[PDB]
Each structure stands twice: as C-alpha cells, then as structure tokens.
Design a protein around this ligand. Structure first.
Ligand SMILES: CC(C)[C@H](C(=O)O)[C@@H](O)C(=O)O
Ligand SMILES: CC(C)[C@H](C(=O)O)[C@@H](O)C(=O)O
Ligand SMILES: [Mg+2]
Ligand SMILES: [Mg+2]
Lengths: 364, 364
C-alpha cells in the first residue's frame, strides 16, 4: 500500500533542490510501482514568517502521520539577528530529534573518483581516497541532559550544561555502528575523551562490551583531539567512526569539508522503528537561492537514503545512487564542482534533475 | 636576583630535548647576565616507575617553590594499559593546572616560510600562509565541573559530567585574547556552541561585554562545528581564536596538524600572577627516544615563552626566537621536516642545539 511522506523544504535553496528530488522520485515511483503520497509543511525561517515559530504544531502533527520526513535546509541572514536559541535551525531540529527519538545519525562521506582535486587536502593525500561513515548518537549527551540553565548574577552568574549517557543509550548506537562496519571494511573507530570525561569512560567500556557480539570487526579507540589530526593525515584508514552527540557534530563537519564536495553529501536521522528524517549535509545557501545554480545531488541522495532505511525499498534506493554516479561520470556537474576555468561547462539545477530522473527511467 | 625553575622532563624524548633547551638557556644566561637555578623532578611515566604515581608530592612541592615549570612530555606504551584515568598524561597535567589555577593556555601556530609544503593542506591554500594564536580556557568548563561520576547499574547505569562557567571565568580569559589581538592583527574569533549549550550563550554574551573595552579589535563568533571546516578553507583569515576548555582542546590540535610541523610548536599555561608551565605541543614520541633524531625546537621555544611570560625577560626570549629562525633558514632541519629524498641532510638533536646555542652566543 501507500506511503506518506512529509516534505519540509525550508529556506533558501531547499525548495529548488526539493523540486528535483520530487522529480527523481516520480521516475522511481513509476519504474518500481510505488505508491507514495507527499504533503508539504512549513519549517524554519518560512515557518517563523508564516506562523510565528520555526516548528508549527500543524507541521509536527503532519510528521506524526508520515512514514518519513524528507527535509531540505533551514536558516538564513534574516533570522540570524534573533537570539541563537530562538532561531530556526536549532528551533526545528532539536525538537524533531527529541520528539521522534531519532537517536541514530548516519553521515556517509566519500571522495568520488575524479573529484579528488576539490578536497582541501594536499594532492598526495587526496589521491588515496577515503570513505568514512560517521555514526553519531543524536538524542543523549550534552544536547538534552539536565540540569541545564543559569543562576546567580553579576560576576558570579553561572551557566551549566550536563552531559549524561546510560549504558542503554550507548549500546544501541554502538550496535548500529558495528553492524554497519560488518557490511563495509570491518573496522569501528570509537571517539571519546576518556582521559577526562566520566561519560567517555562509560562510553569506552560499553563499546567494548558490545564488541563481543562482533568478533569479525576490529575496534579501536581514539581521543577526539587526536582524531581531528589523524583525519588530516590518514583519512583512508578509517571506516566507521562512532561518536557521541557533541563529538559527532564536530567530526562530521570536519570530514564533510575534507571531501571538498558538500553538495554531494546526505544525512539520515532515524529511530529504532525505521522512521527518519533525511536531509542534505550542507546549509540553505541563501545567496544562491532562485538562480538555478544549486547542486541538487545531496537532496536526491537524501531521498535515496529515505527509500532504503525508512521505506525498505533497497532496489529503488540503489537505482538513484547509480543515476547519480552516471551523472558525475558523464560530465553532469554543477558550478561549484568545476575549476573556474571550466565554469562555463556547469549544469543548472534543473538540468541535473532532468538527467538523473531520465537515467532512472532508462533502467540504470 | 636568582630565578628558580622546576624542570619536569618526563618520558620518551623529553630528557633528550630538555638537554638542548638547557644548553640554549646557558647561552642566554651568559649573554644577558641572568642568574637561574634549575631543579629536576620526576613526572609522568618515570614518576609512576620510581614513585608509584604520576605526580609525586615532592614534585608538586618543588613546583610550588619555583618561578616557573619547564615541562617536557609524558606518556608512552608502557603505561597505556592502565585505565585512561590513572595514567600519566592526565594524572600529571590536570592536577598541575588545577593546583596552580593555570587558567590561560596559549598555543601559537604558524606556517614558517619555506616549510609550507609540509602542511597537509592543498598547495594553493598552504601557499597563503597562516598565523593563529589559540587562547584556551584551562581551568573551568567540563574538565573540572561538578557533579561528575556515575550511578545506577546494568542497562540504566549512567555517567554524567557538568560543564560550568561563570562570568568571572569568561571575562578573565576573554581579556587576554583581546589584549593579544591588539598586538597582532586585531581580530578575535570566539568559538562556541551557542545554539545548544547554556554555557555557550553565556560565553558569547560575556565576550561581547568585554569587547566594549577594545573598540579597535574586530570580534566575530563562530560555531565549533563550522570552525573545524573553516580552518581547512581560510586559515589565513583567523588571528586570535578564543575557546573554552574542551573546544580549545579540539581546535588547537586541528590547527597544530595543519602546520605539518609539530616539532616547532610550543604551549604556555599561566595563572594571573605570571607563574606558568611551558611545554612542547607534541607527545613523547617514545619510538624515537635515545636516537638523536628528535626535533628540540619545540622544547627550546617553550623556554623562550617561559622567559617572556613568567620571567619578564623579553630580550632574552626574542633572542632564542631569532636563533631558531636562523637555524630554519640556514638549512638546520631535522629529519621529519625534509622530504625523504632529502633525508640525508637531516641534523641530529645535538647539532640543532649546538647551532642554536651558538647563534645566541654570537649576538643574533
Ligand atoms: C543546528 C545544530 C543544532 C545541529 C547540531 O548541533 O546537531 C547542527 O550543527 C547539525 O550538525 O545538525
Ligand atoms: C592529556 C589531556 C588531559 C590534555 C587535555 O585534554 O587538556 C591534552 O589533550 C592537552 O591538549 O593538553
Ligand atoms: Mg553540526
Ligand atoms: Mg589535547
């Protein structure tokens, strides 16, 4: 029967890249006989303008009635002057994650063949390639721990945040990491600060407990500060990186930037029932919105991740992935992926979407 | 009159690089007529072997009687199998910082002329150069906040750490940052997670309060995740980076690795009275210890920082710095700073020390 998708395109380039993801999805629906219905809701900046808050109740209820959320990007100059805590990115994302218990974040990043030169790494390092899957715990740690707040006044006014983790929270995300590694290159690198943080001592201990179920997977532990360095020297040696909430926030951005190709990167945030929120890794790029320049690949790959993980449609997910590969090796590239002597070869957002949808229809 | 220095050389390469720092310091003492007495104490790994703990009481008392601590490096394979919390690096460093209230950490990093190629950045980025001073708050935040620990058992066993900051703690480190920027390129970039953390909301607020005393210095705020990316794209645009304890731990390592030349980098940790602990940025490199290969420049520059900040001997500090510059542009380089087709030109640890001490004696 029918699937129901909540479409939260957001701000900036969100709507124009979402339109291309819908176009590709239509080709998929036809080719594989899937019956999917979409409802669009305001979120982020547009929601503050139209409803007074970044996550309206009608949008939240709409997501509750869906099988998955296909999310664009939120934020922009306009709302930045608001205080960072009432403000559209955090205002949409933290309650969505908390409400639906989206504990698992997957952020795959790889260097694509032929695009190694866009990486900001030295050429001999980027020529080696890399392919790293960051698994980030999304609902625990210091993001949602209590108590959180402030007290006192004047010089002695103090603020406090509490990082908290339970064995139960650690083992459920660790298992995901190990199961992923088993399908990839069978290595998990767990990232912590166990020489300082009590949470990190528990983290390391629990990850080693979970490891006994996965004797085929190699486990190593690395301190977060050292990890930021090692990713610059030997990114080819990591497979799955397992991180707590805040450490994963930090490392996943570092790794994204190391690709030099953020327009290609997608993210999945899921709960244990398979419901998730699927989004491009980059921001809303408000300075390029409405010009047909934006790269829709990240939003298209988000749809592929949604098909795989929430809708259990592996063949449909794979077909999109292959259509993206065909675009990239047939010279269908957007402007930000070309040296600016090549810039006149750039394809527009719509040309990209047309090409990819056509490839799927053609049986790629 | 006389100055008293506690010498804590530690493990691995610590003693062999410390010997070269002492050699340079002797040339300085003679040239500028300084009267300095040194006492050596065990710390770290060697202290666990000889005394049963990484920071013996006799060493702590010795540091209390000194004007500054000239520190080497601690740690190694041998002690790693101990639990990360009883373990020599953390076991020496956290109590030293806490005991002497060493709230201010300075970690200068720059790309030296002629060594841009050792950076792991793409050549066009590293050709631009950079020079960034990281100012890290060292005694507050999540390192020493309470409560810290665990409770419960089984699946519901939980650990917790508390990040806490007061206005007083934030304003004292911010002022240092602004005063440094005023002597450099008059820009402070404050790094926080103000869209999630209550401490970061207070941080940003207090830094803006302090800013009113420095209308000649430009202030910007950036989120920690975004900062890890921007350092890969435009490191030349940062001057002073101002960070809380954990964010500074992370960013300072990223920046160090971006130089490709960690043997050149030193660190100062100081309290408000001028007492400090001065150390090389890198580790104890136990695999090269005792071979005459290690680069003593970081330990020599630590001594220069000690002369400047704790002993208020600016001319003596500067003379060392210039002697290091003369070595680097006269081809006095250690092995890790040469491409391995050049490796036969490498100077040993002692040759480096002799050259630098000789330069100081010659009036550089
Ligand atoms: C907007 C912010 C709350 C969010 C986070 O910190 O998780 C973002 O940085 C991210 O990586 O998704
Ligand atoms: C050894 C560890 C406690 C220490 C820290 O986290 O401050 C180290 O990583 C550093 O940067 O000096
Ligand atoms: Mg982030
Ligand atoms: Mg560190």
């Amino acid at each position: 029967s029918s699937y129901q998708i909540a479409v939260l395109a957001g701000d900036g380039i969100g709507p124009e890249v979402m339109a291309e993801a819908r176009k590709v999805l239509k080709a998929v629906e036809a080719r594989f006989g899937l019956n999917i219905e979409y409802t669009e809701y305001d979120v982020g900046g547009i929601a503050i303008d139209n409803h007074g808050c970044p996550l309206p109740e009608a949008t939240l209820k709409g997501c509750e009635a869906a099988d998955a959320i296909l999310f664009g990007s939120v934020g922009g100059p306009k709302w930045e002057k608001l205080p960072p805590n009432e403000q559209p990115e955090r205002g949409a994302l933290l309650p969505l994650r908390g409400h639906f218990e989206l504990f698992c974040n997957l952020r795959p990043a790889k260097l694509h063949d032929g695009l190694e030169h866009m990486s900001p790494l030295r050429s001999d390092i980027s020529a080696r390639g890399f392919d790293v899957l960051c698994v980030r715990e999304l609902t625990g740690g210091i993001y949602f721990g209590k108590p959180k707040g402030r007290q006192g006044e004047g010089e002695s006014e103090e603020a406090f945040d509490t990082m908290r983790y339970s064995r139960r929270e650690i083992s459920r995300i660790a298992r995901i990491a190990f199961e992923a590694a088993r399908g990839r290159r069978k290595k998990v690198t767990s990232v912590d600060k166990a020489n300082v943080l009590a949470c990190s001592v528990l983290w390391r201990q629990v990850v080693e407990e979970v490891a006994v179920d996965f004797p085929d997977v190699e486990l190593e532990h690395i301190y977060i500060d050292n990890a930021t360095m090692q990713l610059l020297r030997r990114p080819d040696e990591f497979d799955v990186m397992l991180c707590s909430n805040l450490f994963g926030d930090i490392l996943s951005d570092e790794i994204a930037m190391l690709t030099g190709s953020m327009g290609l990167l997608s993210s999945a945030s899921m709960n244990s029932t398979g419901f998730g929120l699927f989004e491009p890794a980059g921001g809303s790029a408000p300075d390029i919105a409405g010009k047909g320049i934006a790269n829709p690949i990240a939003q298209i790959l988000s749809a592929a991740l949604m098909l795989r993980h929430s809708l259990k449609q592996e063949e449909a997910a794979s077909a999109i992935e292959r259509a993206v590969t065909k675009a990239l090796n047939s010279g269908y590239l957007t402007g930000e992926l070309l040296s600016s002597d090549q810039r006149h070869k750039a394809k527009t957002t719509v040309q990209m979407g047309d090409f990819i949808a056509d490839a799927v229809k053609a049986g790629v």
